[PDB]
Predict the 3D structure of the following.
Amino acid sequence: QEKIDRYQVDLEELSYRLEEQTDVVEEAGELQAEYEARTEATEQEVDELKSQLADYQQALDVQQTRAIQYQQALQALERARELCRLPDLSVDNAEEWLETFQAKEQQATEALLALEQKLSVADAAHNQFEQAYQLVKNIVGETSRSEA
Amino acid sequence: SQLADYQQALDVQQTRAIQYQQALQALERARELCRLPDLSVDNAEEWLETFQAKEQQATEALLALEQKLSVADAAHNQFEQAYQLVKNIVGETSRSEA
Amino acid sequence: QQDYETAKHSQHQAKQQAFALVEIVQRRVHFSYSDSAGMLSENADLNDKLRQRLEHAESDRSRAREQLRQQQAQYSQFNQVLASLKSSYETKQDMLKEL
Amino acid sequence: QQDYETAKHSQHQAKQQAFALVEIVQRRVHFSYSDSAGMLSENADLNDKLRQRLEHAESDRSRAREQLRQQQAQYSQFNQVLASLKSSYETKQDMLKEL
């Protein structure tokens, strides 16, 4: 009788916890829906602003005249100039740099694969070590690798 | 942004075309190395996982090989002694069967 | 040792092939730039093609969004069932202790 | 693994540099007619102001998306604790009925 009384009290407490967590989850779901609406409103505003800017600039950027096209080449050349440590980098001599850096890239990939082979074998060796460790732990329980 | 900023001036378009050419080159290179003219971007993942299994098999093999080579450091004497012990216990046996 | 050098060469072959396939996996999007490469070849008024590509991308993104949402719901369902099993196991184990 | 991580970083940087050089090679033709010029900054004022407003809207959208994601998270953990309580209560109720 006493045992059943204890379990009934336990169930009462669990019911109170369930009520509290249900209320918390309902509040969280309401907040989640509110934030969904707020987010969708933000993308709506962003898309509207983008479309309106497109409409306003329609006439502006259509007549590019392939004349403001070359600044893109200028930015690309400069971006390579800082990225590639070649202040003398010229579109004329940039081909020798291209081939040399491609050679370096392929060498790097080969070294990467060489490292990858040994990395994989080492990781799998550690995996078998670990498997031995789990088997030992399951059979006997906690123990160090040295005792394994 | 490209449509809104049409002043972008096809720079991103140029970069994307260059990326497309690079991807074409890479796809051809893989079809060569993997020798898979039958190949597509959509289904290349399947051959990727197949060769992942292939590479795993090769690496597990070579792992057992690494262990065997490492234990091969055992000198000539141990093999002889074990062989003669097995012979004396069971009788004459071949080293392969020992 | 001979077989081991042979196996190492085979592993290198597998490594290079897998790396190449992975590289094309990364360039997956770049193959979508075939439209961009064709668009860039316009060399003239091409905003309408940009808008068409944008609409196609919107359709793809909405498809991916629905896929993600339903998969998230499925994962959440799996997670609640797992948590329910965890709690049930805890309770059963505690009763076993008490008995 | 540390060494391979460093090697992969180096490979990535080399690939980026090679791609930049390829970009220079491709845009050599555009450099060819670098002498050309055209009118600019006709409707820049309104365009610039609208760009600023759109940037503000995009930043607000990013904040909104971050809040949405995090709230999805906390809602998820709340649901998980709710399910754990459900399982505990169900098990204890079953056990009380058994007793």
